[PDB]
Structures are given as structure tokens and as C-alpha cells.
Amino acid sequence: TIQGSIVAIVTPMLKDGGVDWKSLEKLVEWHIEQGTNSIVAVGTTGEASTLSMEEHTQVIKEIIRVANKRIPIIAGTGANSTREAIELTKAAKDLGADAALLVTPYYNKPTQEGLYQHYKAIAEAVELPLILYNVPGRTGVDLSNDTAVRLAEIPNIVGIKDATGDVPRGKALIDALNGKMAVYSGDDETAWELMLLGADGNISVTANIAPKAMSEVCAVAIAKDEQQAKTLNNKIANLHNILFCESNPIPVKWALHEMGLIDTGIRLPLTPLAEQYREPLRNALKDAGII
Amino acid sequence: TIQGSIVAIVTPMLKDGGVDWKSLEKLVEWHIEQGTNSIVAVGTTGEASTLSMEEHTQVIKEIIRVANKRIPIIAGTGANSTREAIELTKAAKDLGADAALLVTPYYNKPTQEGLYQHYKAIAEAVELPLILYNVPGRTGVDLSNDTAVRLAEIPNIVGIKDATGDVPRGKALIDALNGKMAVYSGDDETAWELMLLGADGNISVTANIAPKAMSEVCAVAIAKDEQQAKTLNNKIANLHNILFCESNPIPVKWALHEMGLIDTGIRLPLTPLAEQYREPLRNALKDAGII
Numbered sequence A, B: 001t002i003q004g005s006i007v008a009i010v011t012p013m014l015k016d017g018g019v020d021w022k023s024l025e026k027l028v029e030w031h032i033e034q035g036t037n038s039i040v041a042v043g044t045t046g047e048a049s050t051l052s053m054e055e056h057t058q059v060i061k062e063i064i065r066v067a068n069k070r071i072p073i074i075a076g077t078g079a080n081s082t083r084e085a086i087e088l089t090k091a092a093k094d095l096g097a098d099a100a101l102l103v104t105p106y107y108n109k110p111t112q113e114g115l116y117q118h119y120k121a122i123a124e125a126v127e128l129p130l131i132l133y134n135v136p137g138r139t140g141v142d143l144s145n146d147t148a149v150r151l152a153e154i155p156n157i158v159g160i161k162d163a164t165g166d167v168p169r170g171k172a173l174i175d176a177l178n179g180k181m182a183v184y185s186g187d188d189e190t191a192w193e194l195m196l197l198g199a200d201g202n203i204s205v206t207a208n209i210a211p212k213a214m215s216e217v218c219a220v221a222i223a224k225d226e227q228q229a230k231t232l233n234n235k236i237a238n239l240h241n242i243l244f245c246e247s248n249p250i251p252v253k254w255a256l257h258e259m260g261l262i263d264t265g266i267r268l269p270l271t272p273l274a275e276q277y278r279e280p281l282r283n284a285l286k287d288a289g290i291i
Helices: A021-034 A053-067 A082-094 A112-125 A145-151 A167-177 A188-196 A211-222 A226-242 A250-258 A275-287 B021-034 B053-067 B082-095 B112-125 B145-151 B167-177 B188-196 B211-222 B226-235 B237-242 B250-258 B275-287
Strands: A004-008 A038-041 A073-076 A099-103 A130-134 A157-162 A182-185 A201-204 B004-008 B038-041 B073-076 B099-103 B130-134 B157-162 B182-185 B201-204
Touching (some): A038 A053, A053 A073, A073 A082, A099 A157, A112 A145, A167 A182, A182 A188, A201 A211, B021 B053, B112 B145, B188 B237, B201 B211, B211 B226, B226 B237
Parallel strands (some): A004 A038, B038 B073, B130 B157, B157 B182
């Protein structure tokens, strides 16, 4: 079902770190107007880690309100505790989220059977479409393709965000699944390829700052137009790179600030983009024609 | 100041995952009796991630109560949010913890400067001895020796738990600190070595099942007795390996079960040790004369 360019929206903050509700509202409107197909609220890019449970609820609520049913909203509800993931996911359901995005438990390093039981327990506890999320580099754990395939048999497990950037492996997963659940790219650099290979969309960092362009790249890639996909992606390829010069979402928040869209707010332990990356980022934005 | 065998105690649980208070009390008394020099409450091994905020407090409170000042108690108070780390560390201070152990923020991957400011903010917020904890394979971030040496300048940053298992690197850290803060091994396999090279102790997993033997390994290693350190470590060297056959604390909780000291409870996403590892574990315990 949910297809195309799916922005993992930043959570705009005032300089003191408070959520900048006004900027958030404008960003959501801007995304819908520019062609973004769906929004992931409070994912990794949205600083899920440093917003409280009540702040998760408010950001999710506000995005849904502004969206006003124009596009589906996915709520980031991952946690490294199964019980906590259940509570976050139930809250998302009650707020009227269309689906929930759940990163694999990070830090505690569950076994593959543990990941299976984690997601099974969540699926069975909450009637909401669930999207798995694999990002071994951040989590210390790698949900295998085999476990991913096992999980697609569970009702309410409807997709996986594959952030490995490993294209052959993602193709292998898409092929093994044979449509049993959706595969989304979680790696902007290679997303155009994955989508040409059958992925349903891109849960994107770059879409934060190039929503029109990324909406077009996903549309043509889904349509299997390889040449159009190469060409349109090429125009924003350097952004997929520069946006990770420091840990996401550090660069992307700075990029939006240079666009005059949000203030500099960002919560410790994350920090504003280091001084030396600011000029190279502004240059990349100018090159891409963003500013 | 704090030296020797510092057990990162498990949190015993009933089959339904409820904390087993009686068994926890007995473990603490057993450690004290057996020569364990300090206890870390609700560290990684203690399943910090799956215990609620109240349970974090209850467990800290109970270990302190039962210890009754016979040995220092160090509270695990890590978080990937700086605000939340402060709150946990303040609670730990309030409970009478002797120090706090704070893993580097996991999953959200702060920069080196972010790690510095995170810990600096915590130190300035809470008048309590703090112990850094670096375990890159779990957290997705590596606190460099450089950043650690910088943080050693902050008054109440009194040590670091180095779980890299990289002895040349741990030696380099010890030499560069030249006494400004303590270095503790966070790797049982190489702890004896690090202690011979200058570490003040071992914040140990193996000490959960072999408190006596680890107490002695540390004592002779800290006393710079290389031959006795090796000979004593040899007796429990296979344990350092087998206790990680699946992610800690899965194997150690089961080992304690095999010893008859705790029940099988462990909280999702963690799972009881896989059947295939149970007999090899039993054997290792018999070989080491634990059972």
C-alpha cells in the first residue's frame, strides 16, 4: 500500500531544544504541496531518542492534524524494550497513525529468534500495520533476510525499511518475499536502484530538503524507468552523500536551517553541524539548486 | 579509588519477567561473602534497557540496602538522551549510589564533541562520581582515547569502562591518562591483561558465576603478578568465552540458573539461552568446578 517518497521528517526545534510547532506545521504543508507521498513522524531523523513519550505523541498528533488525511502518516514507535515498543505503538494507533515504523531493538543485541518474538509480540498486541526497520550500523544487530521473511507471515507486519545500502541483498529479500510484504529503501544513495528492483519506496533523509526531486525519483523508479531514475537521481546524488558527513540528522537539520525553514535546535547528545561542514553543505545545496 | 572485581550483576527475574527480589538479595550477599569488591546495578548485564524507571530505582535501592555499605555500589544510569541520563544519574545520587556508570549514547551516534558535551553536561548537573563506558559493537559509536583523556579533566569523571577488548589501545589510554582517571576492563577475556598493564579493575560478567576466582584474578593482576594472574585466569578462561555464545546477559543468566541461584526470567527482546548452547555451558561450568 504506502508507496513512493516517504520523508523521515526532522523534528524542528527552537534554540533551547523545545519543539518548534510552527516550523513543523509549515514543513508538513510544504511536503504535501511539493509531492512527498507520506511522512514518518519521529523516526531516527526526527530525533525519536531525545523526545519524551509525551513529545512523541504531540509530534505524531500535529503531523496527522496538518496532513488532514491528504497523505498517510507513519509513526516511529521503535524501542529496545518490547513492552515499551508495544506502548508506543498502541499510542500511535490511538492517534490514528496509518502504520508504525519500528527499528530493531538497539544496544541490547537480541538474537534472531529474539527479534522474531519482539515483532510478533508487538503485532499481536496492537492492530496496526507495522514496518520493520533494519540499520545494523546504528543498532548493533542485523535482522537477517531469513528472519525478515519469517516475519512477513505475521499479520500486521506489512513491510521492512532496509537501510543496509546493500543492493544485491535487498534484491534477494524482495525476490524471496514475492510480494508478501513491502520493502523500502532506507539508504538514499542506493534507493533509486532498490526501487527499480521492486522496492515500494524510499523512506528518505534527502527528501527532507529535496521533496519534489525525491518524489520524482521514486515515481520514475517505481515505474521501472531506469534511465529517468538515473538521470533524476544524478541531480541530487551528492546530497545523499553530504547529508551524512556527520551522523544523520545533524547535517539535514543544518541544511534546512540554511534554507530558512527551521531554527538551529537539536538535542544533546546530538550537536549542530560542526562549523567546517557548513560551507561545503551550502555549496552542495547551491549545486543541486536547492538554494 | 574503586578497584578489583566489580560484578555487573544480572537482575534476577521470575518466569513472567517480574524482578525476583529474594534472589537478587541472595546474589548480593553471596557476592559480598565471596570477595566481590563492588557491584554495578542495572548495567547492560542487568538488563537496564528493559527495566522501567521505577524498577531502575527499586533495583538500585535494594542492592544498596542489602549491601549496607560493605562494598561500593555503582549504578548504571546510561541513556542515549542527555536529559534522561541526568535524571537517572540524579536519582542514583539520591539513592546513595557511590558512583554512576554511563554507557555512551547508543543508536543515535553522536559526534566526538557530542559525547564530550553529553558527559560534561552530566558531570556539571550531578555531583556524583561518573564512570564512562565504551562498547562500540553495541552502541554504534566509539568514544576515542582522545575524547576520554579530555573528559578525564572534568572533576567528577573518575573512570572509564573499556569494553573494546583491544589491549594495545587500552594500554595507550592508561599511559595517556597517567593516573587522571581509572580504566576498568569491560572485557573478561582480556581483563587480566589490562589490569597487569594498569587498569584498576574489571567490571565483569564472569564475576556473576565465579565471584571468588575473579576477585583473586583481579587482586593478583592489580598487584602486577603476571604469573599468578595468568595461572588464575586460566582456570576460568573458557568461561569468558562461553558467556558470550549469545548476547550477554543471555548466557550468564542461564548459567546462574544452572547453578540454581535464579529462575529463567529474561525480558523481550532478550530470550532464554538457546537449547543448543545449554549443554556446552553446563560442561564449562562443571569443568571450572562451578557446578
